[PDB]
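HOLO CASE FILE
Compound: 1,4-benzoquinone
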Amino acid sequence: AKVLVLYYSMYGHIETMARAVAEGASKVDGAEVVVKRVPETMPPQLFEKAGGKTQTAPVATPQELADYDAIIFGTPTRFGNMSGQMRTFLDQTGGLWASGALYGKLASVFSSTGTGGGQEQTITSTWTTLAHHGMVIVPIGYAAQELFDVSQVRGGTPYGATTIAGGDGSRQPSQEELSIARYQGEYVAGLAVKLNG
Amino acid sequence: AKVLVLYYSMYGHIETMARAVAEGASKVDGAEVVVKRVPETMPPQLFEKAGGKTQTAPVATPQELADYDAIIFGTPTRFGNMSGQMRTFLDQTGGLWASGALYGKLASVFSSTGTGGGQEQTITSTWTTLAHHGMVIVPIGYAAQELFDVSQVRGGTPYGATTIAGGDGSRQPSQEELSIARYQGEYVAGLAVKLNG
Amino acid sequence: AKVLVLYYSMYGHIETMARAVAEGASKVDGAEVVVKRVPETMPPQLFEKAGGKTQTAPVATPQELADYDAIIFGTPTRFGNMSGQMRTFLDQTGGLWASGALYGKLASVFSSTGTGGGQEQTITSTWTTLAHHGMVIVPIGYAAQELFDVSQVRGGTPYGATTIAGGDGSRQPSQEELSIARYQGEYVAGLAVKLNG
Amino acid sequence: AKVLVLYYSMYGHIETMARAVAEGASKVDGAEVVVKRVPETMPPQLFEKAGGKTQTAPVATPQELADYDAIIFGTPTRFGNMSGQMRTFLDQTGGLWASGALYGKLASVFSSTGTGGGQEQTITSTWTTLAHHGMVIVPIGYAAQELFDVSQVRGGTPYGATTIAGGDGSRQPSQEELSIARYQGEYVAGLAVKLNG
Ligand SMILES: Cc1cc2nc3c(=O)[nH]c(=O)nc-3n(C[C@H](O)[C@H](O)[C@H](O)COP(=O)(O)O)c2cc1C
Ligand SMILES: Cc1cc2nc3c(=O)[nH]c(=O)nc-3n(C[C@H](O)[C@H](O)[C@H](O)COP(=O)(O)O)c2cc1C
Ligand SMILES: Cc1cc2nc3c(=O)[nH]c(=O)nc-3n(C[C@H](O)[C@H](O)[C@H](O)COP(=O)(O)O)c2cc1C
Ligand SMILES: Cc1cc2nc3c(=O)[nH]c(=O)nc-3n(C[C@H](O)[C@H](O)[C@H](O)COP(=O)(O)O)c2cc1C
Ligand SMILES: O=C1C=CC(=O)C=C1
Ligand SMILES: O=C1C=CC(=O)C=C1
Ligand SMILES: O=C1C=CC(=O)C=C1
Ligand SMILES: O=C1C=CC(=O)C=C1
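Model generated. Tokens follow.
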């Protein structure tokens, strides 16, 4: 089964998450895992002057999403929605839509926020778009036991893994957060191989 | 695979849809299909006086949901949410939740409204609860060609089948609505068999 | 202006919150603030054997919601939705709906969850129902500065105040949580008096 | 009060709706009404080749949103979300957010879809972003009587006006759709005047 982790990250928090998802997915015997990022939409100079992080994952084309059995989408929040970059990219999947190219493919979503607010809404509102493509939607529920832990500030929801970046972007994904992310990749890769070999 | 069509209906619109869903699911050779209803929560005499429809379907218990590989939930809208009767029933699945009894099972949703408004929000707000149980969420996308017909008033969304009951409840599910409902039953059942045998 | 804080609470966390909302609302010159709870739907004996908390707020009728200028709804989550009790109560507002009794009234929502997951979805999915009644929806945004604080586990979202009850129900609303709740009551009471005197 | 009708349109459906909204808002004597569009993000030549409609409305800047008492946002759907063009624009309101520049301002949303699906989800997913800015969210409920008509295919929801463009974009907003749009403009404008003078 082929698994794409398709993400947008400006400052690396979703990048770090995407890597953990990919690691989880790679634990599954029979899973081919690929990590790509969606195109930047900001002018390059503005991206750099805002301190955007350069990334080594290659940029995806809309067209190549058809090659996968499971796509795990990562996006930071922009006010409770997916980022403009992820939105812009999904807006170019109209050809895939008309041909039913993503229909019945597995989809799962992970997110990042500055201070937590909007992390559920970002995921569930991404699910909407996935549903229009007829993708099978995979939440993670409460299998990841870190989800019960209210002793420390922690991303992660039954809807998909999340990370809390701090208001100033200074926080890094915590071990509990990355554990949920790895769980998500492995669970979805498992389902992918179950259905597609 | 075992497929439960679990529904709530007061005036029979969801009940009719539920039979169409069961009918589609039954086309799938590996699929054992059962139709049950959630308990009425209204006093029996207020229900009669309101003109409520009597229904032959057996009443489900919360516990028996664990016995199935896929549950397709039918509910009328109450102001853009599932009905209090469906909510009440799902609020009694806390034991199933704690044991992960519905985790990884397939879930799909269909709905009915008086005049169309809230039909999307009912389905996707229902998906939220399904996600807490770690259920795999199954939208229908646009495989059902009737979803492209805008020549007549008709329910059905990429999220799941719907019906339009009319302001006074006098409309009956149309051929196109029932056909989307059958498709949804077949699609979910085929996925249930693909996953579980 | 008259402000109703209308809540459901089984174990007191939303009750404690509702009291803080009411206190906030009472700081506003010209605001008449009333606190009532919706009816219990569980059999009384089961309510007691589950350790349900007895409450001194009187039970509201659906009919009396028409008397207010602003209604602040409090509910704990049941899997990312409002509780069955709140759902059941709102389902009896069909008379108010047909007469436009809540149309243009202010509405705001606060929630409680065991471990955080579903707290955004509970609020925004309650907003849906409020919208069908034509209520003006009041989120709190980021005016409450505790919302920037990622140093301690903390409820509260830009959508409305929330509290984290702990998996076992043992946590009590924190000062930061109650501060956001008080903010919400006062902000909404302010708007109520601005519009209605 | 100053009322901004801010929209994105590729094929003119939202543009037509936007003019109807402006028209309704202008009926309110205290209301100064301005119609602006968000920038196109497609290369100018891809836009022409796609058959995009040229539009006379001035292009808004993110900053000038601060100047208004009420903003009514129009966007076509992209798979159940606002369009990438609207998302991109709203992603540039981080300065306004940090200064609380839109806090307490009125917000209301209208949408357009090819065949109806995603019309609710587009509006309410847009409300999420509005809530992060602390905007007061203004749904239309069922004051517009056309919302009770199920005799013809027509957009319009309790969340805000919508139009149905057809699969090929050939439908024009109907009389009933435009009338819901006018109502929404009038209602929001009257609220803007009631709050701000
Ligand atoms: C336009 C804009 C809107 C944002 N909205 C939110 C928000 O609603 N809630 C929040 O917690 N953080 C918000 N943030 C913070 C981003 O989500 C955060 O910087 C991102 O998660 C970091 O992930 P990345 O490093 O992968 O880019 C916003 C940031 C920008 C630039
Ligand atoms: C409390 C209440 C709330 C309702 N809210 C809506 C609504 O928001 N939108 C709508 O189109 N119909 C609404 N209706 C209509 C019901 O959804 C409709 O009667 C139901 O779909 C009929 O399905 P059934 O025959 O299976 O019970 C409402 C009805 C009641 C009693
Ligand atoms: C049926 C049921 C479902 C629940 N679902 C969730 C949930 O999805 N997320 C969560 O964090 N807590 C969940 N809980 C916990 C309740 O939300 C928590 O006990 C409540 O917030 C306490 O508030 P109260 O004391 O006012 O009743 C659930 C509890 C029950 C009984
Ligand atoms: C990328 C893309 C995604 C779309 N997704 C949907 C959709 O989910 N549902 C729908 O009914 N129409 C969909 N459409 C149709 C547009 O919403 C429709 O063309 C638009 O409402 C026309 O409005 P406008 O003329 O103002 O641009 C989509 C179109 C594009 C280009
Ligand atoms: O190009 C497109 C037009 C309409 C739609 O729904 C999807 C793609
Ligand atoms: O009793 C219960 C309490 C909380 C929950 O999430 C499930 C069951
Ligand atoms: O009683 C009723 C209340 C609301 C509605 O939409 C339909 C019936
Ligand atoms: O620059 C920024 C503006 C707003 C926000 O929420 C995070 C970063």
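CASE NOTES: Chain C has six helices and seven strands. The first strand of chain C starts at residue 2 and ends at 7.
CLOSED: yes
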